[PDB]
C-alpha cells in the first residue's frame, strides 16, 4: 500500500532487469516520437538514444517494486544509482 | 524431473528465496546472498601457517622486544614505538584474529584454507602497487590507527540487507562474518606496512575497491535460481564400494526405501 | 431522471502527449469522450461538474504500445431513465405502430396497442397525426408519456412508454 | 521450427518474459475472446457489427470483458467444457 | 488481424475449476442435436439440428456461423447439448461417487456416525478437504448400519449395503443376504436428499460442486472448432471420432427412449441403458480398463478427449508448454575463424525469407523509403508495409500501382540486414548457454557460419549438425534480448564459476607452438601479423 | 541430520564424476526436498500431491486426474505460477516482468 | 420498476470519490436546469480564462455561445436545455430553496420529492396516480397545500 520514502528498505542500485526494461520501454517510446530530453550527437538508433538518456538520468520514469506481501515501493530511475 | 522439480523458485525484492506460493526455501540465496558469477577461490590466511608463523605475523609489539615493529618500514616508525594506545589496538586486532582462528577451526575441520568467496583482494593489491608505483625500500606514510580504524570502518560498509531491525542485522552479521574474517586476515598492519608498503591513497583506493566489488558481488533480486540450480545439477549428469553415477542419482532423487549398497563408516 | 454521480474513467494517451501540459489534454479527452456519449450503466451522460478540481491520481504504463493509462474520478450530471416513470415529451417521427416521443436525449416509443381505443391513427394528414375523441397528437404537440420499460444496452438506451392510463396523453 | 518446453525453460532461465510472451502469442497464434463478469465462461455472444454482446444463461448485456489468449488455450477450455469441467476466468482477484 | 472490439481489455488472473451443472449446461447450449446424421439429406450444407449444424461453429472460411456471424478465424464456437432420459455416470468420478456412497446413508441421506463420536470430532478439525474426505471415508466405510438413537441424531437404521464397482456399475450387498444393483436414479435421489453440512463436510462447495452434479444428466456438445471435419474432393468427407461418439450417444438415447415409451421388456431397457452408459463412458474416456474398447470403422481406436489431454505432444506438451513457431530457420552450422565471437553468418536466402517489422520514424524515413524503392527481390529492400490503419500492403503487385510513400506511424517489414540480434539454439539444449543471442552477418552459401569459441557451450561439432535461429519481432524484446542474452555476457557461466568458452582445436595447438622459445618471426610477416589485429594501435 | 546427510549423498556422486558444482545449487536442491518436514521424493507423487495450482500440477504428468479432482473439490488457482501464466499467454512475474513500470508526471517538467 | 427499488448504482446509499457516505441526489426539472445552465457559465469562464495566454431566444443564443465552447459533440445537452426550459415553470435558486423547504418538511424520499417538484398537478389524486410510490406515505391535504404554495411560486416568464 505504497511504503513511504523514509521506510523504503530495498536495494538502491538499479538491477540489470530494471535497466533492461527501462531502456526497452524508453527506447520504444523514443521510437514512437517521444520528447527527447537530451541533445543528440547525431544518433539515429532509438536504443542508443535511450542509453544516452540513462547515462544522464533524464529518463522520466519511476519503478514500482512489488513486495512479496502485496505492497510496493516507488524508486525513481533518477535517484537509482546505475552500475 | 529436475527442470519440472525446480521451476517456480525465485528471489524476491527482500533477498529471500521463496517460491510462488510464498513458501520460504532459503532465507538467503546460497546462504550468503552472492551470485554464482562473481565468486573466486580464495585462501584463508587465518588458519594457514604454524603458531610461530601466526604470532610472528600478527604481532606488532611497541613496548616489547619479542615481536617489535621495524621502524624503517614507515616514515614515523621512530614515534610509533613506545605508544600504548596503538599497542592496545594491536591487542584488540590480534585477539580478534585469534577468535577468528578458533571459529575457523570449528567451522572447517578438514584443514583446507581454499574456499570460494567473492572479491579478489590480490588483484586489487597488485593493481594498487602497479598503479601508485609502490616498490620496495620505500617508507610508508600510514600508521596503526589508519589501518586498524580503516578496516574497522570498512567492516561496517559491507551491506547485503538494507534493513535496520534486530533479526536483519543478525542475519547480516552472520552472513558477513566469514568475509570480515578474510578481510581482517588479509588486511593486517604487518602485511601492509611490511610486505605491501601501501601509502594513503593506495590503501584508501584498496578499501574503495573492496567495498565497491563487494557491492557488485551481490546477487540481484528477481533471478530464477531454481532453474539455474536444476541445470547446474542436470548438466553434470550428462557426463556420467558403494554404487555411483546415474543409478545412485536415481536412488537419491527418488528417495528409495532400499539402496544398492547399504554401507556404513564406523569411526 | 436527471441525477448527479461521481464517475471514474480510464483514459489512454499516446506517448506523443507526454508534455508538461499533458494534464490539460487529459481533461480535454475527459470531456470529448464523456460529455454527450451514453453508458448502459449510468444512462445518458449530460454534463461534467467540477472542471478545476479534477483528480489525476497516478498514470500507469501498460506493456506493449507504450500508451499511458489513467484512472480519473470526477463528478458528472447524467440522465437515466426508469421503468414506470411519468415524463413529458414532444413527438418527432410518426409510425403506424405508434408515435416516437422525444424526452431529452432519449427517443421513447409508444406502441399502438398501449394506447386507448378512441385514439386512432390518421395518415391522410401532413404530417400523419393520431386523432382521438378530443385530442390530436401531432409532431409539435406535447404529450405526457408514462414509461413502462427501459433497455440499458451499452452506449445505447431505448425505452417504451404508454398513455393508456388516466392523467396521461397530450399536454 | 518447434519452440519446445526446454527452450521455454531456457527463456525462463535468462529471465526474459516479454520475448516468451511474444514468441508464444504474436509469433505463433493469438486469439481474442470475451468472457462474462458473473460466470467466467466463453458464452458471450459477440455481434459487434452494431456493438452488441450477450452471455447466455446469466442475464448479462453490460459487463463483458475482453481477453487475449492463445487458440490452444481456448481449445483446452472448450474441451474442458465438453468434459463437464468449468474453466472460469476472472480478471479481478476475489480471494485477495 | 482480427476485428476490433469495444470491450475493456484486461489480463486473466484467478481461474476457478468446478463441475458443470446440468441447468448451466442447458443455459449455455443453443441446440438440442437430435439427428445422428452429419450433413443434410441433400449431401450439402448442414443437417440443421444435428451433429454439426450452423447453430454451432463452422470452418471452411466461406461459412459464417449463424449465431456468432463473423468468420471462422473469429468464431470461438457455440455449444449444443443432449438431454438424456436416463442419468449416466462420469468416468473420472465413478470412484468418487462410490466413496460418497460409502460416506452417506442410502435412505435418509445422512452422514454415518455423528458429531458425538470422538474420531469424527478429531477428523472434522482438519482444514484440508481431501484429508477430511479420506479419513471420514475410512470411518464411514466400516459402519454398515445407520442408527436412530446414539448415546451422548437422525433416524433411519436401515442396514447400509456394501457398494462394489463392477462393469461401470455399483452393486450393493445386504447381509440382513439380499444383493441389489444400485441404479443411477436411486443414487441421484439419495444425492438429492443430502444436507448442506453433509456434502460440505466431504469437500464440496455449493456454488461450484454438487454430488447431484457429479452424475451426468445433460451432455454438452462442443462445436466443430473443437472437432473440425473435412470435405476432401467433395466425395471423401471425414468426420472426427467425437462426432461418431455423439452419433452413438444419440442412437442409444433415442433407442432407449423408444424402448421405454412403448412397453418394458426389463432386459432390453438394461441393455440399452448399459449401451448408452458405454457410449458416454467411451465418449469421455475410451481407454477405460475392464471395459471393451470402441473401434472406428477404419481400423483405429476412437480418439477421445482424455486421449487428447493425456499423451505427450498433445494439448499440454505440444500446444501450451511448447509449440511450432514462425520466424525461424534451421540448417547446418559450420565454422569461420574470420568472424567475431558473438556474430553468426546468415545465408542470403534466409535473410530474404525472414523479415522484421520496423517502425517508420523521421530518423529512417529515407532509408526505409529506399528499401521500399528497391523491391523484395533485392536484399536491401522490404516485403510488406503496414499503414497506421492496421492494414498490410504487399510490395508484390504494388509496383503495378506505381508509387508508395511512407508516413509517420507506419510499420515497414524489412529483411534481416546486419547488426540484428537473433536467438541461436541447438537441440536438445540442456544449458542456458545453449540458447544465446547473436549479431547477424549476411554471407552467401547456405550454412550458418560462426566462430569456434561458441561450439563448446552448444556441445556441437561440424559434422552435419543443424541449428535453429529465432528472430524477435519487436524492439522491446530485441533490446531486452540484447541486454540479457549475449555471448560476451555469457563468457563466465555460473555453473562452475569458470569460463565456459575458450580456445579450442587448431588454435590452441598453434598458440603453444607460437609461444615456444624457438619460435621467431621475420619482419615481413610480423607486419602482417600486427596488421591482422582489428584494434591495433599501429605502434610496431 | 537427514538434511546434511542428503547433501553429502548428492555431493558424493558429483565429486565421483570428477566435476565441480557450486555450493548454492546443491544447497537449494537439498533444502527444497526438506522444507515440508521429513524427506520428500522428486517424483510425480512428490509435488503433484501438494497444492501449487491445478494447472502447475496437471502440466507435468497426470493432466486429467488433477483437473477432475480440481473441478470436483472446487479448487481455486492463484495464477501467479510460471506454467499458469504461460498457459494463459501473458506476462509472468519473472525477471523483467517481476516489476511494473510507471510514469511520474512530476518528472516530465524536469 | 417504480417501487422505490432502483439499480445498484442508483440505490439510496451512495459513496463519493473521497470515501464518505452520501444519500442519493434526486433533482426535479426545476433546479436541474439552473445547475446545467449554471455550470456552463463557469465552464465558459474557464474557456475564456485559458484563451488569454423572449425566453427562447436567450436560451438558444446562450446555447450557441456555449456550443462554441464545446467541441460540437454534445448538442443533445442543449436540446435537453430546450426540453427543460419548455417544460420548466420555476426560476431563481431562492424560490428553489423554498421548494426544498416545502418538500423536506414532509419527510419523504428524494426521488419522491423530485417527482413531486418535477410534475405539475392540481389535486392530490393526480400526484398519487402519477407517482405510484406516494399513495399513503403522506396526507392528501398537505400535498394540495404544497401545490397551492407552488402555484403561487410559478410565474409566466
Ligand atoms: Mg553431431
Ligand atoms: Zn456470463
Ligand atoms: Zn460462432
Ligand atoms: Zn440412515
Curated annotation (Swiss-Prot), chain A:
The chain holds residues 72 to 154 of 155 of the full protein. Belongs to the archaeal Rpo6/eukaryotic RPB6 RNA polymerase subunit family. It is found in: Cytoplasm; Nucleus. Residues 40-61 are annotated as: Leucine-zipper. This is DNA-directed RNA polymerases I, II, and III subunit RPABC2. DNA-dependent RNA polymerases catalyze the transcription of DNA into RNA using the four ribonucleoside triphosphates as substrates. Common component of RNA polymerases I, II and III which synthesize ribosomal RNA precursors, mRNA precursors and many functional non-coding RNAs, and small RNAs, such as 5S rRNA and tRNAs, respectively. Pol II is the central component of the basal RNA polymerase II transcription machinery. RNA polymerases are composed of mobile elements that move relative to each other. Its main location: cytoplasm. One of its GO terms (biological process) is ribosome biogenesis. It comes from the Eukaryota. Component of the RNA polymerase I (Pol I), RNA polymerase II (Pol II) and RNA polymerase III (Pol III) complexes. Component of the RNA polymerase I (Pol I) complex consisting of 14 subunits: RPA135, RPA190, RPC40, RPA14, RPB5, RPO26, RPA43, RPB8, RPA12, RPB10, RPC19, RPC10, RPA49 and RPA34. The complex is composed of a horseshoe-shaped core containing ten subunits (RPA135, RPA190, RPB5, RPO26, RPB8, RPB10, RPC10, RPA12, RPC19 and RPC40) where RPA135 and RPA190 form the DNA-binding cleft. The gene is RPO26. Transmembrane segments: none annotated.
Swiss-Prot record, chain B:
The tandem 7 residues repeats in the C-terminal domain (CTD) can be highly phosphorylated. The phosphorylation activates Pol II. Phosphorylation occurs mainly at residues 'Ser-2' and 'Ser-5' of the heptapeptide repeat. The phosphorylated form of Pol II appears to carry, on average, one phosphate per repeat. The phosphorylation state is believed to result from the balanced action of site-specific CTD kinases and phosphatases, and a 'CTD code' that specifies the position of Pol II within the transcription cycle has been proposed. Transmembrane segments: none annotated. It is found in: Nucleus. It comes from the Eukaryota. Coiled coil: none annotated. The C-terminal domain (CTD) serves as a platform for assembly of factors that regulate transcription initiation, elongation, termination and mRNA processing. Mutagenesis experiments demonstrate that the minimum viable CTD contains eight consensus Y-S-P-T-S-P-[A-S-N-G] heptapeptide repeats. Identical and simultaneous substitutions in a number of consecutive repeats are lethal: 'Ser-2' -> 'Ala-2' (14 repeats), 'Ser-5' -> 'Ala-5' (15 repeats), '2-Ser-Pro-Thr-Ser-5'-> '2-Ala-Pro-Thr-Ala-5' (10 repeats), 'Ser-2'-> 'Glu-2' (15 repeats), 'Ser-5' -> 'Glu-5' (12 repeats), '2-Ser-Pro-3' -> '2-Pro-Ser-3' (15 repeats) and 'Tyr-1' -> 'Phe-1' (12 repeats). This is DNA-directed RNA polymerase II subunit RPB1.
Swiss-Prot record, chain C:
This is DNA-directed RNA polymerase II subunit RPB7. Keywords: Cytoplasm, DNA-directed RNA polymerase, Nucleus, Transcription. Its main location: nucleus. Present with 6420 molecules/cell in log phase SD medium. GO terms for molecular function: single-stranded DNA binding; single-stranded RNA binding; translation initiation factor binding. Transmembrane segments: none annotated. It comes from the Eukaryota. The keyword Nucleotide-binding does not apply. Pfam families: S1, SHS2_Rpb7-N. One of its GO terms (cellular component) is nucleus. Belongs to the eukaryotic RPB7/RPC8 RNA polymerase subunit family. Component of the RNA polymerase II (Pol II) complex consisting of 12 subunits. RPB4 and RPB7 form a subcomplex that protrudes from the 10-subunit Pol II core complex. The RPB4-RPB7 subcomplex probably associates with TFG1. Interacts with NRD1 and PAT1. One of its GO terms (biological process) is DNA-templated transcription initiation. DNA-dependent RNA polymerase catalyzes the transcription of DNA into RNA using the four ribonucleoside triphosphates as substrates. Component of RNA polymerase II which synthesizes mRNA precursors and many functional non-coding RNAs. Pol II is the central component of the basal RNA polymerase II transcription machinery. It is composed of mobile elements that move relative to each other. RPB7 is part of a subcomplex with RPB4 that binds to a pocket formed by RPB1, RPB2 and RPB6 at the base of the clamp element. It is found in: Nucleus; Cytoplasm; Cytoplasm, P-body.
UniProtKB/Swiss-Prot annotation, chain F:
The tandem 7 residues repeats in the C-terminal domain (CTD) can be highly phosphorylated. The phosphorylation activates Pol II. Phosphorylation occurs mainly at residues 'Ser-2' and 'Ser-5' of the heptapeptide repeat. The phosphorylated form of Pol II appears to carry, on average, one phosphate per repeat. The phosphorylation state is believed to result from the balanced action of site-specific CTD kinases and phosphatases, and a 'CTD code' that specifies the position of Pol II within the transcription cycle has been proposed. It is found in: Nucleus. It comes from the Eukaryota. There is a cross-link at residue 8 (Glycyl lysine isopeptide (Lys-Gly) (interchain with G-Cter in ubiquitin)). Signal peptide: none annotated. Belongs to the RNA polymerase beta' chain family. Component of the RNA polymerase II (Pol II) complex consisting of 12 subunits. Interacts with DEF1; the interaction is direct and serves to bridge RPB1 to the Elongin complex in a DNA-damaged dependent manner. Interacts with the Elongin subunit ELA1. Interacts with the Elongin subunit ELC1. Interacts with ASK10. Interacts with ESS1. Interacts with RTT103. Interacts with SHE2. The C-terminal domain (CTD) serves as a platform for assembly of factors that regulate transcription initiation, elongation, termination and mRNA processing. This is DNA-directed RNA polymerase II subunit RPB1. It comes from Saccharomyces cerevisiae (strain ATCC 204508 / S288c).
Amino acid at each position: 500500500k505504497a511504503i513511504p520514502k523514509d521506510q523504503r528498505a530495498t536495494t538502491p542500485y538499479m538491477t540489470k532487469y530494471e535497466r533492461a526494461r527501462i531502456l526497452g520501454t524508453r527506447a520504444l517510446q523514443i521510437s514512437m516520437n517521444a520528447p527527447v530530453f537530451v541533445d543528440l550527437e547525431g544518433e539515429t538508433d532509438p536504443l542508443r538514444i535511450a542509453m544516452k538518456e540513462l547515462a544522464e538520468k533524464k529518463i522520466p520514469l519511476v519503478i514500482r517494486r512489488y513486495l512479496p506481501d502485496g505492497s510496493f515501493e516507488d524508486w525513481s530511475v533518477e535517484e537509482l544509482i546505475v552500475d | 524431473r529436475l527442470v519440472k522439480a525446480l521451476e517456480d523458485i525465485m528471489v524476491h525484492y527482500d533477498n529471500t528465496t521463496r517460491n510462488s506460493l510464498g513458501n520460504v526455501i532459503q532465507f538467503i540465496y546460497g546462504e550468503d546472498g552472492m551470485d554464482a558469477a562473481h565468486i573466486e577461490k580464495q585462501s584463508l590466511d587465518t588458519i594457514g601457517g604454524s603458531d610461530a608463523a601466526f604470532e610472528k605475523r600478527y604481532r606488532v609489539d611497541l613496548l616489547n622486544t619479542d615481536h617489535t615493529l621495524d621502524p624503517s618500514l614507515l616514515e614515523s616508525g621512530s614515534e610509533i614505538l613506545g605508544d600504548l594506545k596503538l599497542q592496545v589496538l594491536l591487542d584488540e586486532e590480534y585477539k580478534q584474529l585469534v577468535k577468528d582462528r578458533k571459529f575457523l577451526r570449528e567451522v572447517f575441520v578438514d584443514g583446507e584454507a581454499n574456499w570460494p568467496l567473492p572479491v579478489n583482494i590480490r588483484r586489487i593489491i597488485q593493481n594498487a602497487q602497479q598503479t601508485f608505483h609502490i616498490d620496495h625500500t620505500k617508507p610508508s606514510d600510514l600508521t596503526i590507527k589508519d589501518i586498524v580504524l580503516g578496516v574497522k570502518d570498512l567492516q561496517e560498509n559491507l551491506l547485503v540487507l538494507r534493513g535496520k531491525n534486530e533479526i536483519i542485522q543478525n542475519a547480516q552479521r552472520d552472513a558477513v562474518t566469514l568475509f570480515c574474517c578474510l578481510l581482517r586476515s588479509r588486511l593486517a598492519t604487518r602485511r601492509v606496512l611490511q610486505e605491501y608498503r601501501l601509502t594513503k591513497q593506495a590503501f584508501d583506493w584498496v578499501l574503495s575497491n573492496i567495498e565497491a566489488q563487494f557491492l557488485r558481488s551481490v546477487v540481484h533480486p528477481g533471478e530464477m535460481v531454481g532453474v539455474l540450480a536444476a541445470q547446474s545439477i542436470g548438466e553434470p549428469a550428462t557426463q556420467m564400494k558403494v554404487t555411483s553415477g546415474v543409478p545412485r542419482l536415481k536412488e537419491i532423487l527418488n528417495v528409495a526405501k532400499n539402496m544398492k549398497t547399504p554401507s556404513l563408516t564406523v569411526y | 431522471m436527471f441525477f448527479i454521480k461521481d464517475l471514474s474513467l480510464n483514459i489512454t494517451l499516446h506517448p506523443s502527449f507526454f508534455g508538461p501540459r499533458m494534464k490539460q489534454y487529459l481533461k480535454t479527452k475527459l470531456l470529448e469522450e464523456v460529455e454527450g456519449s451514453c453508458t448502459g450503466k449510468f444512462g445518458y451522460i449530460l454534463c461534467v461538474l467540477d472542471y478545476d478540481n479534477i483528480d489525476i491520481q497516478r498514470g500507469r504504463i501498460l506493456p506493449t504500445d507504450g500508451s499511458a493509462e489513467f484512472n480519473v474520478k470526477y463528478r458528472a450530471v447524467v440522465f437515466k431513465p426508469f421503468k414506470g416513470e411519468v415524463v413529458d415529451g414532444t413527438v418527432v417521427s410518426c409510425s403506424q405502430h405508434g408515435f416516437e416521443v422525444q424526452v431529452g436525449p432519449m427517443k421513447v416509443f409508444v406502441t399502438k396497442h398501449l394506447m386507448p381505443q378512441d385514439l386512432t391513427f390518421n395518415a391522410g394528414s401532413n404530417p400523419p397525426s393520431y386523432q382521438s375523441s378530443e385530442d390530436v397528437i401531432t409532431i409539435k404537440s406535447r404529450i405526457r408519456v408514462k414509461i413502462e420499460g427501459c433497455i440499458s444496452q451499452v452506449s445505447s438506451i431505448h425505452a417504451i412508454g404508454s398513455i393508456k392510463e388516466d392523467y396521461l396523453g397530450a399536454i | 521450427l518447434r519452440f519446445g518446453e526446454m527452450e521455454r525453460d531456457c527463456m525462463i532461465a535468462h529471465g526474459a518474459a516479454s520475448f516468451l510472451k511474444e514468441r508464444l502469442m504474436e509469433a505463433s497464434d493469438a486469439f481474442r475472446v470475451h468472457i462474462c463478469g458473473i460466470c467466467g465462461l466463453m458464452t458471450v455472444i459477440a455481434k459487434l457489427n452494431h456493438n452488441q454482446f450477450e452471455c447466455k444463461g446469466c442475464d448479462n448485456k453490460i459487463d463483458i470483458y475482453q481477453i487475449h489468449i492463445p487458440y490452444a488455450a481456448k481449445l483446452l477450455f472448450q474441451e474442458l467444457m465438453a468434459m463437464n469441467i468449468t474453466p472460469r476466468l476472472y480478471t479481478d482477484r476475489s480471494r485477495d | 488481424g482480427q476485428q476490433y472490439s469495444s470491450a475493456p481489455l484486461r489480463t486473466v488472473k484467478e481461474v476457478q475449476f468446478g463441475l458443470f451443472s446440468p441447468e448451466e449446461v442447458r443455459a449455455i447450449s443453443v441446440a438440442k442435436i437430435r439427428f445422428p446424421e452429419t450433413m443434410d439429406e441433400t449431401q450439402t450444407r448442414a443437417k440443421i439440428g444435428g451433429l454439426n449444424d450452423p447453430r454451432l461453429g463452422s470452418i471452411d472460411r466461406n461459412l459464417k456461423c449463424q449465431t456468432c456471424q463473423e468468420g471462422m478465424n473469429e468464431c470461438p464456437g457455440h455449444f449444443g447439448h443432449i438431454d438424456l432420459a436416463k442419468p449416466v455416470f462420469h468416468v473420472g468420478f465413478i470412484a468418487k461417487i462410490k466413496k460418497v456412497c460409502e460416506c452417506v446413508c442410502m435412505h435418509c441421506g445422512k452422514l454415518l456416525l455423528d458429531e458425538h463420536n470422538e474420531l469424527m470430532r478429531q477428523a472434522l478439525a482438519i482444514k484440508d478437504s481431501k484429508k477430511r474426505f479420506a479419513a471420514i471415508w475410512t470411518l464411514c466405510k466400516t459402519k454398515m448400519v445407520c442408527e436412530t438413537d446414539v448415546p451422548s441424531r437422525g433416524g433411519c437404521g436401515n442396514t447400509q449395503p456394501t457398494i462394489r464397482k463392477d462393469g461401470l456399475k455399483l452393486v450393493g450387498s445386504w447381509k440382513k443376504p439380499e444383493l441389489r444393483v444400485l441404479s443411477t436414479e436411486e443414487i441421484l435421489n439419495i444425492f438429492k436428499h443430502i444436507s448442506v453440512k453433509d456434502f460440505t463436510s466431504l469437500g464440496f462447495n455449493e456454488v461450484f460442486s454438487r454430488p447431484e452434479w457429479m452424475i451426468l444428466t445433460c451432455l454438452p456438445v462442443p462445436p466443430p472448432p473443437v472437432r473440425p471435419s473435412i470435405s476432401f474432393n467433395e466425395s471423401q468427407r471425414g468426420e472426427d471420432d467425437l462426432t461418431f461418439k455423439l452419433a452413438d450417444i444419440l442412437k442409444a438415447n433415442i433407442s432407449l427412449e423408444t424402448l421405454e415409451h412403448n412397453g418394458a421388456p426389463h432386459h432390453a431397457i438394461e441393455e440399452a441403458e448399459s449401451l448408452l452408459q458405454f457410449h458416454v463412458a467411451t465418449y469421455m474416456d475410451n481407454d477405460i480398463a475392464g471395459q471393451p474398447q470402441a473401434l472406428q470403422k477404419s481400423g483405429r481406436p476412437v480418439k477421445s478427449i482424455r486421449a487428447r489431454l493425456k499423451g505427450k505432444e498433445g494439448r499440454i506438451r505440444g500446444n501450451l508448454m511448447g509449440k511450432r513457431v514462425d520466424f525461424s530457420a534451421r540448417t547446418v552450422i559450420s565454422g569461420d575463424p574470420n568472424l567475431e565471437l558473438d556474430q553468426v553468418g546468415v545465408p542470403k536466402s534466409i535473410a530474404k525469407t525472414l523479415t522484421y517489422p520496423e517502425v517508420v520514424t523521421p530518423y529512417n524515413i529515407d532509408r526505409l523509403t529506399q528499401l521500399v524503392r528497391n523491391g523484395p527481390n533485392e536484399h536491401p529492400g522490404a516485403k510488406y508495409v503496414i499503414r497506421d490503419s492496421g492494414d498490410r500492403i504487399d510490395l508484390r503487385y504494388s509496383k503495378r500501382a506505381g508509387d508508395i510513400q511512407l508516413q509517420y506511424g507506419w510499420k515497414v517489414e524489412r529483411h534481416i540486414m546486419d547488426n540484428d540480434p537473433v536467438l541461436f539454439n541447438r537441440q536438445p539444449s540442456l544449458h542456458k548457454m545453449s540458447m544465446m543471442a547473436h549479431r547477424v552477418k549476411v554471407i552467401p552459401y547456405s550454412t550458418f557460419r560462426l566462430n569456434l569459441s561458441v561450439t563448446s557451450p552448444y556441445n556441437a561439432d561440424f559434422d552435419g549438425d543443424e541449428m535453429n535461429l529465432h528472430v524477435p519481432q519487436s524492439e522491446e524484446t530485441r533490446a531486452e534480448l540484447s541486454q540479457l542474452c549475449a555471448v560476451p555476457l555469457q563468457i563466465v557461466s555460473p555453473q562452475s564459476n569458470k569460463p565456459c568458452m575458450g580456445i579450442v582445436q587448431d588454435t590452441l595447438c598453434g598458440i603453444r607452438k607460437l609461444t615456444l622459445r624457438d619460435t621467431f618471426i621475420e619482419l615481413d610477416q610480423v607486419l602482417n601479423m600486427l596488421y591482422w589485429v582489428p584494434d591495433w594501435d599501429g605502434v610496431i | 541430520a537427514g538434511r546434511a546427510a542428503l547433501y553429502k549423498e548428492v555431493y558424493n556422486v558429483i565429486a565421483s564424476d570428477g566435476s565441480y558444482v557450486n555450493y548454492r545449487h546443491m544447497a537449494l536442491l537439498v533444502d527444497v526436498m526438506t522444507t515440508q518436514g521429513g524427506l520428500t521424493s522428486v517424483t510425480r507423487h512428490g509435488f503433484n500431491r501438494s497444492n501449487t495450482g491445478a494447472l502447475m500440477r496437471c502440466s507435468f504428468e497426470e493432466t486429467v486426474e488433477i483437473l477432475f479432482e480440481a473441478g470436483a473439490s472446487a479448487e481455486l488457482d492463484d495464477c501467479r505460477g510460471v506454467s499458469e501464466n504461460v498457459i494463459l499467454g501473458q506476462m509472468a512475474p519473472i525477471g523483467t516482468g517481476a516489476f511494473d513500470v510507471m510514469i511520474d508526471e512530476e518528472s516530465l517538467v524536469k | 420498476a417504480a417501487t422505490l427499488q432502483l439499480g445498484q448504482e442508483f440505490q439510496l446509499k451512495q459513496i463519493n470519490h473521497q470515501g464518505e457516505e452520501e444519500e442519493l441526489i434526486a433533482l426535479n426539472l426545476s433546479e436541474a436546469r439552473l445547475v446545467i445552465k449554471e455550470a456552463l457559465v463557469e465552464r465558459r469562464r474557464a474557456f475564456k480564462r485559458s484563451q488569454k495566454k423572449t425566453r427562447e431566444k436567450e436560451l438558444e443564443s446562450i446555447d450557441v455561445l456555449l456550443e462554441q465552447t464545446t467541441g460540437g459533440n454534445n448538442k443533445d445537452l442543449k436540446n435537453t436545455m430546450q426540453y427543460l426550459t419548455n417544460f420548466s415553470r420555476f426560476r431563481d435558486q431562492e424560490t428553489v430553496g423554498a421548494v426544498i423547504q416545502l418538500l423536506k418538511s414532509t419527510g419523504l424520499h428524494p426521488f419522491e420529492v423530485a417527482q413531486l417538484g418535477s410534475l405539475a398537478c392540481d389535486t392530490a389524486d393526480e400526484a398519487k396516480t402519477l407517482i405510484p410510490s406516494l399513495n399513503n406515505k403522506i396526507s392528501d391535504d398537505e400535498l394540495e397545500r404544497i401545490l397551492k404554495e407552488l402555484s403561487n411560486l410559478e410565474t409566466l416568464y
